[PDB]
Design a protein around this ligand. Structure first.
Ligand SMILES: CO[C@@H]1O[C@@H](C)Cc2oc3cc(O)c(O)c(C(=O)O)c3c(=O)c21
Ligand code: NA
Ligand SMILES: [Zn+2]
Ligand SMILES: [Zn+2]
Length: 227
């Protein structure tokens, strides 16, 4: 897992898909690592999630063009939080097409954060010059608006923060969470992607379909331990 900046790390999953980790500070959670994917095809790139701010995003945007040689033309945020659209204003200054759950659009609009330009309400298949990018909203989880991005041709699933990493014992940040739904939503994820080769969570190490089960448990536990 190479470093490309003092705060930005990259790992390669396939010839077309990459995952990055950007280290940032958050009042109340300290030094914390946020993930996002980068998908390439015929010199064009789609960016899923952006570091929490415009600076880290820009660095990341140039590394892509400089190292992978690709114009970043597409953006899809997991949900309305800082570690998903934190640098969208930058992307906008540079004419990037934005796509998102319609509820993510409404939430950013009323809190005066940059707004993506096209919402979907159930699913959106976005084409990066040929290669499909399937976005689905299967119910609330970590956040009411959270989606997952599926890659039919790489069997790679970007789960976002509704999925926790294998070493996580804590449910963590449930301030906008929809705990009532979270458990029904995870089942829908496992049922829809039995064959996923790679699964990337919003924070932490990636892996296989077992992060879905690991998370279903951390949550069920929380529903009981507090009930
Ligand atoms: C629990 O997992 C992670 O490990 C601990 C040590 C620190 C941490 O901080 C977070 C802070 C957030 O702003 C946030 O939105 C989440 C969140 O996704 O819930 C996380 C998160 O993931 C984790
Ligand atoms: Na990110
Ligand atoms: Zn979040
Ligand atoms: Zn998160």
């Amino acid at each position: 897992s190479v470093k490309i900046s003092d705060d930005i790390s990259i790992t390669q999953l396939s010839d077309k898909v990459y995952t990055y980790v950007s280290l940032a500070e958050i009042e109340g959670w300290g030094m914390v690592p946020s993930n996002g994917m980068i998908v390439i095809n015929n010199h064009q790139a789609a960016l899923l999630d952006t570091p929490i701010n415009d600076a880290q995003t820009e660095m990341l945007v140039n590394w892509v063009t400089d190292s992978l040689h690709a114009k970043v033309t597409t953006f899809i945020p997991n949900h309305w939080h800082g570690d998903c659209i934190g640098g969208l204003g930058y992307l906008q200054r540079k004419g990037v097409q934005s796509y998102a759950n319609q509820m993510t659009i409404d939430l950013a609009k009323e809190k005066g954060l940059p707004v993506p330009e096209h919402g979907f309400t159930d699913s959106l298949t976005v084409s990066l010059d040929g290669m499909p990018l399937q976005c689905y909203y299967l119910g609330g989880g970590h956040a009411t608006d959270n989606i997952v991005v599926w890659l039919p041709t790489e069997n790679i699933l970007f789960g976002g923060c509704m999925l926790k990493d294998n070493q996580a014992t804590s449910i963590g940040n449930i301030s906008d969470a929809d705990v009532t739904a979270w458990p029904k939503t995870l089942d829908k994820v496992k049922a829809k992607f039995p064959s996923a080769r790679y699964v990337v969570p919003g924070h932490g190490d990636y892996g296989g379909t077992e992060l879905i089960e690991h998370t279903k448990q951390i949550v069920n536990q929380y529903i009981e331990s507090t009930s």
